[PDB]
Design a protein around this motif. Structure first.
Motif, PDB file in Angstrom:
ATOM      1  N   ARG B  73       0.808  -1.214   0.000  1.00  0.00           N
ATOM      2  CA  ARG B  73       0.000   0.000   0.000  1.00  0.00           C
ATOM      3  C   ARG B  73       0.844   1.268   0.000  1.00  0.00           C
ATOM      4  O   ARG B  73       0.361   2.310  -0.453  1.00  0.00           O
ATOM      5  CB  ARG B  73      -0.962  -0.014   1.187  1.00  0.00           C
ATOM      6  CG  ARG B  73      -2.109  -1.017   1.011  1.00  0.00           C
ATOM      7  CD  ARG B  73      -3.405  -0.340   0.536  1.00  0.00           C
ATOM      8  NE  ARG B  73      -3.769  -0.666  -0.846  1.00  0.00           N
ATOM      9  CZ  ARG B  73      -3.889   0.221  -1.838  1.00  0.00           C
ATOM     10  NH1 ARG B  73      -3.679   1.519  -1.630  1.00  0.00           N
ATOM     11  NH2 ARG B  73      -4.231  -0.199  -3.047  1.00  0.00           N
ATOM     12  N   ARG B  76       3.179   4.306  -4.200  1.00  0.00           N
ATOM     13  CA  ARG B  76       2.173   5.223  -4.709  1.00  0.00           C
ATOM     14  C   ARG B  76       2.263   5.446  -6.204  1.00  0.00           C
ATOM     15  O   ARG B  76       1.233   5.698  -6.840  1.00  0.00           O
ATOM     16  CB  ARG B  76       2.314   6.584  -4.025  1.00  0.00           C
ATOM     17  CG  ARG B  76       1.558   6.717  -2.714  1.00  0.00           C
ATOM     18  CD  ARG B  76       1.482   8.185  -2.282  1.00  0.00           C
ATOM     19  NE  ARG B  76       0.876   9.028  -3.316  1.00  0.00           N
ATOM     20  CZ  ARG B  76       0.871  10.359  -3.306  1.00  0.00           C
ATOM     21  NH1 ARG B  76       1.446  11.026  -2.313  1.00  0.00           N
ATOM     22  NH2 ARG B  76       0.293  11.027  -4.296  1.00  0.00           N
ATOM     23  N   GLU B  93       1.656  -6.406 -13.117  1.00  0.00           N
ATOM     24  CA  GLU B  93       1.529  -7.195 -11.888  1.00  0.00           C
ATOM     25  C   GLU B  93       1.736  -6.332 -10.653  1.00  0.00           C
ATOM     26  O   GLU B  93       1.055  -6.508  -9.635  1.00  0.00           O
ATOM     27  CB  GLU B  93       2.533  -8.355 -11.938  1.00  0.00           C
ATOM     28  CG  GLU B  93       2.627  -9.120 -10.631  1.00  0.00           C
ATOM     29  CD  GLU B  93       3.496 -10.370 -10.719  1.00  0.00           C
ATOM     30  OE1 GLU B  93       3.593 -11.103  -9.704  1.00  0.00           O
ATOM     31  OE2 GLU B  93       4.029 -10.656 -11.819  1.00  0.00           O
ATOM     32  N   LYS B  95       0.915  -3.204 -10.399  1.00  0.00           N
ATOM     33  CA  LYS B  95      -0.327  -2.466 -10.178  1.00  0.00           C
ATOM     34  C   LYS B  95      -1.387  -3.338  -9.504  1.00  0.00           C
ATOM     35  O   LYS B  95      -2.157  -2.860  -8.656  1.00  0.00           O
ATOM     36  CB  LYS B  95      -0.881  -1.911 -11.490  1.00  0.00           C
ATOM     37  CG  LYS B  95      -0.076  -0.804 -12.089  1.00  0.00           C
ATOM     38  CD  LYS B  95      -0.776  -0.114 -13.235  1.00  0.00           C
ATOM     39  CE  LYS B  95      -1.805   0.881 -12.744  1.00  0.00           C
ATOM     40  NZ  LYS B  95      -2.787   1.242 -13.798  1.00  0.00           N
ATOM     41  N   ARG B  96      -1.447  -4.622  -9.867  1.00  0.00           N
ATOM     42  CA  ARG B  96      -2.447  -5.488  -9.266  1.00  0.00           C
ATOM     43  C   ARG B  96      -2.148  -5.784  -7.797  1.00  0.00           C
ATOM     44  O   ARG B  96      -3.083  -6.024  -7.009  1.00  0.00           O
ATOM     45  CB  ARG B  96      -2.565  -6.809 -10.043  1.00  0.00           C
ATOM     46  CG  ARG B  96      -3.128  -6.672 -11.452  1.00  0.00           C
ATOM     47  CD  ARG B  96      -3.539  -8.041 -12.033  1.00  0.00           C
ATOM     48  NE  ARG B  96      -2.462  -9.029 -11.952  1.00  0.00           N
ATOM     49  CZ  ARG B  96      -1.523  -9.206 -12.880  1.00  0.00           C
ATOM     50  NH1 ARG B  96      -1.542  -8.499 -13.981  1.00  0.00           N
ATOM     51  NH2 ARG B  96      -0.580 -10.123 -12.719  1.00  0.00           N
ATOM     52  N   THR B  98      -0.166  -3.827  -5.616  1.00  0.00           N
ATOM     53  CA  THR B  98       0.150  -2.692  -4.768  1.00  0.00           C
ATOM     54  C   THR B  98      -0.861  -1.571  -4.983  1.00  0.00           C
ATOM     55  O   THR B  98      -1.725  -1.626  -5.857  1.00  0.00           O
ATOM     56  CB  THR B  98       1.556  -2.130  -5.054  1.00  0.00           C
ATOM     57  OG1 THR B  98       1.546  -1.443  -6.311  1.00  0.00           O
ATOM     58  CG2 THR B  98       2.605  -3.233  -5.075  1.00  0.00           C
ATOM     59  N   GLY B  99      -0.699  -0.499  -4.229  1.00  0.00           N
ATOM     60  CA  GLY B  99      -1.482   0.696  -4.490  1.00  0.00           C
ATOM     61  C   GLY B  99      -0.984   1.584  -5.606  1.00  0.00           C
ATOM     62  O   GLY B  99      -1.507   2.688  -5.783  1.00  0.00           O
ATOM     63  N   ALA B 100      -0.018   1.144  -6.390  1.00  0.00           N
ATOM     64  CA  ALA B 100       0.702   2.063  -7.262  1.00  0.00           C
ATOM     65  C   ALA B 100      -0.098   2.460  -8.496  1.00  0.00           C
ATOM     66  O   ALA B 100      -0.795   1.639  -9.110  1.00  0.00           O
ATOM     67  CB  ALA B 100       2.026   1.425  -7.707  1.00  0.00           C
ATOM     68  N   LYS B 101       0.046   3.721  -8.876  1.00  0.00           N
ATOM     69  CA  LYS B 101      -0.468   4.254 -10.126  1.00  0.00           C
ATOM     70  C   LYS B 101       0.705   4.612 -11.014  1.00  0.00           C
ATOM     71  O   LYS B 101       1.786   4.915 -10.525  1.00  0.00           O
ATOM     72  CB  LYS B 101      -1.391   5.433  -9.865  1.00  0.00           C
ATOM     73  CG  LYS B 101      -2.669   4.925  -9.137  1.00  0.00           C
ATOM     74  CD  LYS B 101      -3.727   5.979  -8.922  1.00  0.00           C
ATOM     75  CE  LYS B 101      -5.022   5.321  -8.443  1.00  0.00           C
ATOM     76  NZ  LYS B 101      -6.152   6.278  -8.390  1.00  0.00           N
ATOM     77  N   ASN B 132      -2.130  -0.147 -18.010  1.00  0.00           N
ATOM     78  CA  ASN B 132      -2.685   1.162 -18.327  1.00  0.00           C
ATOM     79  C   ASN B 132      -2.033   2.231 -17.469  1.00  0.00           C
ATOM     80  O   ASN B 132      -1.723   2.014 -16.291  1.00  0.00           O
ATOM     81  CB  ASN B 132      -4.176   1.167 -18.019  1.00  0.00           C
ATOM     82  CG  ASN B 132      -4.930   0.175 -18.849  1.00  0.00           C
ATOM     83  OD1 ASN B 132      -4.685   0.063 -20.050  1.00  0.00           O
ATOM     84  ND2 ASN B 132      -5.841  -0.558 -18.229  1.00  0.00           N
ATOM     85  N   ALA B 133      -1.773   3.374 -18.080  1.00  0.00           N
ATOM     86  CA  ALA B 133      -1.314   4.521 -17.320  1.00  0.00           C
ATOM     87  C   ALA B 133      -2.486   5.216 -16.646  1.00  0.00           C
ATOM     88  O   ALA B 133      -3.574   5.294 -17.195  1.00  0.00           O
ATOM     89  CB  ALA B 133      -0.624   5.471 -18.277  1.00  0.00           C
ATOM     90  N   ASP B 134      -2.250   5.730 -15.445  1.00  0.00           N
ATOM     91  CA  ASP B 134      -3.260   6.470 -14.693  1.00  0.00           C
ATOM     92  C   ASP B 134      -3.161   7.973 -14.872  1.00  0.00           C
ATOM     93  O   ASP B 134      -4.153   8.686 -14.646  1.00  0.00           O
ATOM     94  CB  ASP B 134      -3.075   6.156 -13.210  1.00  0.00           C
ATOM     95  CG  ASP B 134      -3.272   4.716 -12.929  1.00  0.00           C
ATOM     96  OD1 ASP B 134      -4.447   4.278 -12.860  1.00  0.00           O
ATOM     97  OD2 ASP B 134      -2.271   3.962 -12.833  1.00  0.00           O
TER      98      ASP B 134
END
Ligand code: DQM
Ligand code: DQM
Ligand code: DQM
Ligand code: DQM
Ligand code: CL
Ligand code: CL
Ligand code: CL
Ligand code: CL
Ligand code: ZN
Ligand code: ZN
Ligand code: ZN
Ligand code: ZN
Ligand code: ZN
Ligand code: ZN
Ligand code: ZN
Ligand code: ZN
Lengths: 265, 265, 265, 265
Positions: B73, B76, B93, B95-96, B98-101, B132-134
């Motif tokens: 978490r 970021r 993987e 992104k799935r 962790t909380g990372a964007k 995908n990029a956030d």
């Protein structure tokens, strides 16, 4: 006190006024509205559409294509000036209703895929149905349909992905180098020190020089008024059209004025 | 005679050799493998990861993050040098798990979203799980995490979306301007007259000048060998590191040599 | 006669009337408007938002979250009833402004990613900013945040991806099985022989049975009126709420009536 | 000890063994390999491809299409059984090289768009180039190309988006109801209590009943062996083919056996 209602993207009526196809060159036609450009280029190998105007123009565009002998399956390719709602508005619906595939640069593809939301300058104020690009193009890349060669010339500024498209058609047998140059306006934009677009000014200045140097026997623009076209003037619709040089110079003078006004504001 | 089997993207073992975290500056750590950079920057407001290396490195990266006190978490933001399989491999993987964007420019976002397929030079030979990029970033845009300011410097060439990321950390209390400059190689690329990248040469030349001028007390590169880092050398891992000026000059000399060899080939 | 202007998606004022957070259970709060549900579930491991209402509600939702002690980084997960503009409207903006990731089934993810365009029944009449899902869920799958277990129960009909979400909170120490059941309306829909939804009737009938059997000490619905909630009634806002059984039975009776009227029409 | 190299998705050679087109009915041809089905249906209004096999099969498929008189522009539509690498492998490349658009259900579209990554059972072990669907279909929806009507019959299990496609062709003038039924295998799957697919067993059981009831004068399957086809047997390739009833019954018996073995394991 409730939150405000969503505000529809409303435009001048001339932007929504249908017109019959207007011939630009032997195989190039304006098929949009009186005040929004949508160019149909007809080849023996299928049709290309450059821009579609507003979201509600899809059926009108299809009607004008049919009038020109282009059925839905014959539309092969959609190209874009830039991915704002008043130019790429009906692309998603056109893809669903025709055989057309979209080619665009990465910036335009990203904006199109979010339907114009999270715009650098407009936020979510001006959105439209999202569409996916089928092919990503690089600066200077060519796409050839039926021996018509379309060249992409990146001219970032109005949007990051703003593009001029050039091709050569004929007119009375002679070659005509057509330049569909994107908008060079910055409507309500913060130009200096914009955190979402730090090099905005440098990009606009490079884009003025790009437009000035395009192969350009005939210039067309997404808003015909920008290049002094009058699509309602019939046989004289293009008579007063600007050269690419004059269009770039006018856009740069306006931009310099806006910069000075922003400094004073 | 059957069609060929798919060929896995195999690499030198050192590229896959796990290492414990190596401290670069007070809050910046190399947490990838011996021969692939993955930088963790720890702030009081969460952690930033710049690159992840190969697809199979996700669990190792998470282990090294935990060793550093960064839970899933707490991660970021993921930033990328460029979206090839050996640098962005494990992003989906991560992104799935962790909380990372992910923040990236439009070119890198488009390539990441197709998992590296339809590469301008590699085709489908080197793919990885798509992500995908956030957030989409523009050239020169800053992203600030816990008072660490990351600046994007576009340096197109190796990929269209190649980016150098710069930030200032501390080392013995003093400020250290760190430059994570992307690859400047062109491995097996057709440089001249490439229809998928017409302005390749011009972009590389502009990118050499960009790298030469970066704020650059310490240069790091996605392949540490490119900047003369030796992540296995312990307290002397960075002792021989090149300056940004020397890295750019070496890359330009190599590029000029490749151009001449391509002309002769 | 020009083409019609785009028509904004306007709604009753109560749907846009902000309200302060209303406590539903010990850790579950209504934080939307008077007539649109947006549920905040607060755990020691972050906050979950179920629906966000209309596109223009993002800032209000963030204000109410702050009032509840939930900062933007604390919002971990967004769940949806269904991906129409009046329930998923602000999700894209919430993702940009918070740490939140979206979990949804495949049907809801596809509709969300097109911003509600190409709706099976509404066409492009009711669109909103598109957003991407970060996790795809299957029927009956659970998502656990801070020991609150959310279970997805697919109830296709109103949209293909319509979902009921169930979890157990506490109220005066005792367990309360909360059921956030999606809409069971079919507003203006062609029910029989619909080529875009051939098994619509069968799906609605299965969904009535699904809702009737949910674990359901307290039922909530995206339009509170559907379950007889009155978010403006303070300490009696939930006093008249329907059971899940009564909600399903009322929706089935209305649906049977609409079927008969469609046959007669 | 380095991390393991990525492992390529390798398959039996017969799966990659090219074959010339094999006629199934008057307008339906097997154009894939000896052990992977790829069906070409030729209409006066363009060609439909159902599955493409492995990623490396694109050029072979295009060769076989040309041999059949189908040029790249004539391929209008790609349909899929399910979005695994050995059936949807070459779809992205086919879209880039032809006029084809992809129609699929939401589950198959989501899996295709991630190139088969994050598979419910395979993880990232079996990936392929991602592709986007152009049209989303609902259960029982029909797509009509040149008066050939394709009906989608959802048969979730092998993948969530598994689909049987049915259409009627002719053979010696008489109508032939063709059923292209998806795989009903569960290779290495955890069947009971699978958190990523809670209703797996119920879906498989419903799918056996769906397949048993399909209109099915001739059954074809993505792996021809599953329906007792031998594409190398020439004029007797289909002689031993199973009925849909026998295929479903065999798949259910195998599934029941796997369930019992899983309980014992
Ligand atoms: C605010 C205008 C509009 C917007 C745009 O594309 O940015 C759209 C979101 O509303 N289209 C414009 C463009 O430049 O592409 C801008 S500028 C505006 C368009 N035509 C107006 C009158 N001038 S003209 N040259 O056409 O006679 C100025
Ligand atoms: C072919 C190399 C690899 C490829 C790439 O990123 O293009 C990847 C698809 O395999 N990564 C490289 C990069 O530059 O990013 C290229 S160059 C190659 C990497 N390191 C090798 C040895 N030189 S060094 N400078 O690291 O000591 C050269
Ligand atoms: C047409 C209504 C609206 C639309 C929808 O979600 O389909 C939206 C696109 O406008 N939201 C509704 C829903 O059911 O989710 C439908 S039904 C309408 C909502 N509440 C109205 C009054 N009844 S109530 N039960 O809330 O007191 C009926
Ligand atoms: C493990 C097989 C393979 C995988 C799959 O599609 O799940 C792919 C990821 O490798 N394709 C299969 C499918 O069912 O679609 C499974 S089952 C395997 C395929 N054919 C093998 C031999 N049996 S047969 N019936 O064809 O003679 C069994
Ligand atoms: Cl047509
Ligand atoms: Cl964590
Ligand atoms: Cl925050
Ligand atoms: Cl062709
Ligand atoms: Zn514009
Ligand atoms: Zn405009
Ligand atoms: Zn690379
Ligand atoms: Zn590399
Ligand atoms: Zn709705
Ligand atoms: Zn609603
Ligand atoms: Zn499979
Ligand atoms: Zn298979």
């Amino acid at each position: 006190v409730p939150l405000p209602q969503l505000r529809a993207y409303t435009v001048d009526a001339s932007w929504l006024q249908p017109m019959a196809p207007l011939q630009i060159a032997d195989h190039t036609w304006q098929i949009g509205t009186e005040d929004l450009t949508a160019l149909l280029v007809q080849t023996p190998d299928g049709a290309v559409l450059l821009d579609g105007g507003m979201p509600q123009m899809a059926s009108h565009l299809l009607d004008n294509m049919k009038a020109r002998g282009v059925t839905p399956r014959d539309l092969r390719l959609i190209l874009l000036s830039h991915a704002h709602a008043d130019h790429a508005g009906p692309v998603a619906e056109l893809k669903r209703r025709t055989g057309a595939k979209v080619a665009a640069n990465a910036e335009s593809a990203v904006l199109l895929a979010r339907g114009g939301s999270d715009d650098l300058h407009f936020g979510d104020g001006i959105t439209y149905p999202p569409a996916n690009a089928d092919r990503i193009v690089m600066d200077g890349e060519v796409i050839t349909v039926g021996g018509i060669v379309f060249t992409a010339h990146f001219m970032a500024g109005h949007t990051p992905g703003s593009t001029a498209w050039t091709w050569t058609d004929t007119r009375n047998g002679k070659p005509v180098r057509i330049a569909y140059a994107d908008s060079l306006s910055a409507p309500g934009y913060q130009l200096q020190g914009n955190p979402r677009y730090p090099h905005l000014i440098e990009d606009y200045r490079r884009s003025f020089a790009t437009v000035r140097a395009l192969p350009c026997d005939v210039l067309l623009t997404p808003h015909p008024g920008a290049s002094n076209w009058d699509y309602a003037a019939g046989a004289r619709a293009g008579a007063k059209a600007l050269t690419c040089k004059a269009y770039a110079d006018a856009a740069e003078q306006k931009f310099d004025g806006q910069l000075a006004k922003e400094t004073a504001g």
